[PDB]
Amino acid sequence: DINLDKYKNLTRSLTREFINLNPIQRGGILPKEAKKAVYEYWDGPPIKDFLEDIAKFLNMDCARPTHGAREGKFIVMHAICKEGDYVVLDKNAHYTSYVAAERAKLNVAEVGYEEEYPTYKINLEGYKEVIDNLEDKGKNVGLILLTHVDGEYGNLNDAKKVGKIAKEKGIPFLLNCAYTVGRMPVNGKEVKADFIVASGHKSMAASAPCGILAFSEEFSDKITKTSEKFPVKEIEMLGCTSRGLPIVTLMASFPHVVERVKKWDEELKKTRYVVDELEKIGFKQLGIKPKEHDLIKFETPVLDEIAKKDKRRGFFFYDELKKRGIGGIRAGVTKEIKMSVYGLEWEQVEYVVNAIKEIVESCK
């Protein structure tokens, strides 16, 4: 009644045979230490000390482990805000912010762009305005969210501004550092944030659902609110035992991460190398220039032209990348491509760039 053959030859992937350009995976690649830890604990750890240390790493008062930035955002939205409260976020926000807001029965207010094409930079001051427009209508703002780096254009935002605004208005501030914590250094107190969500599998060299929620002492009682029936178990954490593979890989990759954030400018160097070298063949870097993050979005008219006549339609590029052992770009899309070379060896960066150049050169 059930075909089990689809789970037998499951042991197959191009992880070792291909170069992965997908931005959502560059920062989540396990170092060998993490792999050894996986071998050790794939069914079976100084967690408290790790929480204190990850608290210091972000310059924050307290910290808890989650199943990603998703979970953390839902946690703060569910423990701090009351049903009906508004969440004011930027227009470049991740879908999980909106969805977590909707699960917490909260409303959403967006902040416009300082400029659209091709920068798509968020008008940070606009936040202030957007708040007042809500408070004049009598609405209550419960949370101010800012995606530190968005997953579309990879733009870095001066979080200290929105921090100042949030501090003035007295509204709690959540900084979405899913694309930040683990890549670049980040000071929670310096940007005046009350909550910080980090994605372990996206930027902290961990696997599985894995994340961190850092928060100030002010809200410590609310976030870590214990249960009535069980005075030891935290309610929002659903049981303060956070065990499994992801937390192990995270703790194991922690020294690798705290060391690689000190060498963020080298990864930036790789990024800008790719951008500068690709804009020669007809690519146009979208988002803020120059790049302050590894996530790059290119507008590529050339690829669309090649896919036009004729080849295998928009799926040509993908195919032409598979021939050269490169993946991570969505198949079929040619109007624009989204890529990142974070953590790639320089020889591999050169290989990728030269590969792309050869692709556009050979396919006319």
Binding site: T15, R16, E17, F18, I19, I29, K32, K35, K36, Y39, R324, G325, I326, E345, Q348, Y351
Partner: protein, 68 residues
């Protein structure tokens, strides 16, 4: 050298874990040198060192079952 000649013995867990760790370290080359996986002289020495140490540990494991 045949497995059929294997006589009862004890698995050295430490040696096995060492071999595994070595193969895991060697697995890094599959990543940092993809997709061509071609190594230069120094890289070849660095990789083959891991592999050879691994086989050494494996031989130490086989020693406990009547081999040499």
């Amino acid at each position: 050298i045949s497995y059929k000649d294997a006589k009862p013995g004890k698995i050295d867990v430490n040696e096995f874990k060492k071999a595994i760790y070595l193969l895991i370290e060697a697995d890094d080359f599959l990543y940092k040198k993809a997709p061509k996986h071609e190594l230069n002289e120094e890289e070849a020495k660095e990789f083959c060192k891991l592999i050879i140490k691994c086989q050494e540990h494996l031989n130490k494991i086989l020693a406990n079952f009547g081999f040499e």
